[PDB]
Design an enzyme around this catalytic site. Structure first.
Site, mmCIF file in Angstrom:
data_model
loop_
_atom_site.group_PDB
_atom_site.id
_atom_site.type_symbol
_atom_site.label_atom_id
_atom_site.label_comp_id
_atom_site.label_asym_id
_atom_site.label_seq_id
_atom_site.Cartn_x
_atom_site.Cartn_y
_atom_site.Cartn_z
ATOM 1 N N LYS A 49 -56.945 82.469 86.717
ATOM 2 C CA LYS A 49 -58.340 81.930 86.016
ATOM 3 C C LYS A 49 -58.935 80.581 87.104
ATOM 4 C CE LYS A 49 -58.550 78.874 82.355
ATOM 5 N NZ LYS A 49 -58.787 78.582 81.253
ATOM 6 N N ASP A 160 -54.795 79.714 75.132
ATOM 7 C CA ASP A 160 -55.592 78.592 75.029
ATOM 8 C C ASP A 160 -55.791 77.733 73.729
ATOM 9 O OD1 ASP A 160 -56.877 80.369 76.457
ATOM 10 O OD2 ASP A 160 -58.304 81.187 75.644
#
Ligand code: QC0
Length: 347
Positions: A49, A160
């Protein structure tokens, strides 16, 4: 220090160590884009990411630090862990970019959707994951199928966690999904604890068993309507605990639903699966089963091992209550990049 190399992958200039090869974009993760890549050092498939403008504002800056802190602390099979973190910057001054590298699980829980034993295994891994993150006073808050990463072995990791804002007094930019949210965080109508995540597990487990979203609410009120149709309007003892005068007003005005028989809703389900769902999907925040307790429920006899359900080391989230300049969040993140040591590689 490694050699880097640059390419344009969909709007963005990716700049990464030569060690990572064959970057192919897989879509958005939390606060930036994710590439699948190949890690030549380990022979593994990884996800990279690139955070989008990590230091544009206090919100991005603090959230950048939060995520890196979160990742560096988690070490558990069912919780995503940090394989690598890097920047092309060669000093704090030119530090503008953060890249986070983790394992690439093949898929998430949308893609997958299932026999009862599959549901046992998957929900088992979620609760084993939640026990560990809950034991460090970290709460996911937006647990949902798309942040449950699964490989072809049905081995599962949670992504997350810890990002979706703590209160409505703060903004973190993170967008939650209505359908899996506990009525108490969604509506802010009583206090909440870690079991907001158990409600979510309830909703995910139901969906896996029926193929249907349990509560596909079209807004806050419709969502609340769908929920009460199943669980019933709250009792006088529950009303006692609603801190807000408007929520309590609203509820006591709705025409009253009885609680339904979960067996007549989950027909054909393993009855142990039904019993657990009744223990997960209770309005009362103090009465809802915890991760640890759910792990010990007969439903999981095949998977439960009290001596292999570890808790986390203590996690210091005192930074959460601090009010610091973008450059201060920025340098703190820098320290955390520099001190990163990757997991040990055995043979
Ligand atoms: C690579 C990566 C780096 C950091 C984080 N951060 C956290 O999990 C976290 C925990 C607490 O705070 C943050 C997660 C990831 N990560 C890991 N693996 C992934 C695999 C696939 C995907 N994509 C799947 C396909 N979807 C369309 C877009 C997202 C996305 C991902 C994905 O985002």
């Amino acid at each position: 220090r490694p050699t880097f190399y640059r390419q344009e992958l969909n709007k963005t200039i990716w700049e990464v160590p030569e060690r990572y090869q064959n970057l192919s974009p897989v879509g958005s993760g939390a606060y930036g884009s994710v590439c699948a890549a190949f890690d030549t050092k380990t022979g593994l498939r990884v996800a990279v990411k690139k955070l989008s403008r990590p230091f544009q504002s206090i919100i991005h800056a603090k959230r950048t630090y939060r995520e890196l802190r979160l990742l560096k602390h988690m070490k558990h099979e069912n919780v995503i862990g940090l394989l690598d973190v890097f920047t092309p910057a060669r000093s704090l001054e030119e530090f503008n970019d953060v890249y986070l590298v983790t394992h690439l699980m093949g898929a998430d829980l949308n893609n997958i959707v299932l026999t009862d034993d599959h549901v046992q295994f998957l929900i088992y891994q979620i609760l084993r994951g939640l026990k560990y993150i809950h034991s460090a006073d970290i709460i996911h808050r937006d647990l949902k199928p798309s942040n449950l990463a699964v490989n072809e072995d049905c081995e599962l990791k949670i992504l997350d966690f810890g990002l979706a804002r703590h209160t409505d007094d703060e903004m973190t930019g993170y967008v939650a999904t209505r359908w899996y949210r506990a009525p108490e965080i969604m509506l802010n109508w009583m206090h909440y604890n870690q079991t907001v995540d158990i409600w979510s597990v309830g909703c995910i487990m139901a969906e896996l068993l029926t193929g249907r979203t349990l509560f596909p609410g079209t807004d806050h009120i419709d969502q609340l309507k769908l929920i009460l149709r199943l669980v019933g309007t709250p009792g006088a003892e529950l009303l006692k605990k609603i801190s807000s005068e408007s929520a309590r007003n609203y509820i006591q005005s709705l025409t009253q639903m009885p609680k339904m028989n979960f067996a007549n809703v989950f027909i054909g389900a393993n009855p142990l699966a039904v019993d657990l769902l009744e223990k997960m999907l209770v309005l009362d925040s103090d009465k809802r089963i915890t991760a640890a307790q759910a792990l010990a429920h007969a439903y999981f006899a095949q998977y439960h091992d009290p001596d292999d359900e570890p808790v986390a080391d203590p996690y210091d989230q005192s930074f959460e209550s601090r009010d610091l300049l973008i450059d201060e969040w920025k340098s703190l993140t820098y320290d955390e990049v520099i001190s990163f040591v990757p997991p040990p590689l055995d043979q």
